[PDB]
Amino acid sequence: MEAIAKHDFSATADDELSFRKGQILKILNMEDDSNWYRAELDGKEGLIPSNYIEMKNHD
């Protein structure tokens, strides 16, 4: 349910979000299990590129 940005990301679509390396993005919906994901940042929802993040949660 928690993830961290391994790199920088800028939305490539209207329904997308953005994030920077080291930040903690909240997962809410991963879609249909493919290339675009959905998280919450600063109380905002939007999709993200799956290849730019990595499942976190804890050690």
From Swiss-Prot:
Annotated localization: Membrane; Synapse
Tissue note: Found mainly in the developing eye and in the antennal disk. Also observed in other imaginal disks tested and in the embryo. Expressed in Johnston's organ, the hearing organ, neurons (at protein level).
SH3 domain span: 1-58
Disruption phenotype: Embryonically lethal. Loss in Johnston's organ causes scolopidium abnormalities.
TM stretches of this protein: none
Subunit-level organization: Interacts with autophosphorylated sev via SH2 domain and Sos, Dos and Dab via SH3 domains. Binds to tyrosine phosphorylated Dab via the SH2 domain. Interacts with phosphorylated Ack.
Biological role: Adapter protein which modulates signaling mediated by several receptor tyrosine kinases such as sev and Ack. Required for proper signaling by sevenless. May act to stimulate the ability of Sos to catalyze Ras1 activation by linking sevenless and Sos in a signaling complex. Required for functional and morphological integrities of the scolopidia, sensory neurons and the antennal mechanosensory and motor center (AMMC) brain neuropil. Required for Ack-dependent suppression of apoptosis in the eye.
Family designation: Belongs to the GRB2/sem-5/DRK family.
Name the record gives this protein: Growth factor receptor-bound protein 2
Organism of this sequence: Drosophila melanogaster
Range of the intact protein held here: 1 to 59 of 211
